[PDB]
Amino acid sequence: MKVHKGDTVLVISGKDKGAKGKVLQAYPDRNRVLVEGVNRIKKHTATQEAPIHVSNVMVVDSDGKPTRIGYRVDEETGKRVRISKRNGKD
């Protein structure tokens, strides 16, 4: 996916819309990501958060506003690189 483990994201749909966090685990096969502070659930002992669908997040470009992800033609060294749209640089 375009959302990686260390990325910081913003929630664009669901109960926790508008919250900010960073990914903790990516599940490319199921198209889910685990983000702290989002849909924390009260499991029974003897509270943690559950993964949300990757469609519900935007990767924050680390420059403020959320954005969609594109790629620039690198390599030139030595492979492809992930950058942003909406004034993209990465």
Q: Which residues bind RNA (CB under 7 A)?
A: 1-2, 4-5, 10, 12-18, 25-29, 31, 39, 41-46, 50, 52-58, 65-66, 68-71, 78-80, 82, 85-86
- CA 35 to chain centroid: 8
Amino acid type, 15: K
Of the candidate spans 31-39, 55-63, 68-76, 82-90, the one that interacts with Mg ion by CB under 5 A turns out to be 55-63
Residue 12 interacting partner from Mg ion, RNA, none (CB closer than 5 to 8 Å by kind): RNA
**By the rule CB under 5 A, 31 interacts with Mg ion:** no
Cα distances (Å, whole numbers) of residue 25 to 35, 52, 71, 89: 8, 11, 23, 24
Name which of 8 and 39 has its Cβ closer to RNA. 39
| Adjacent-strand bridge partners of 34 | 25
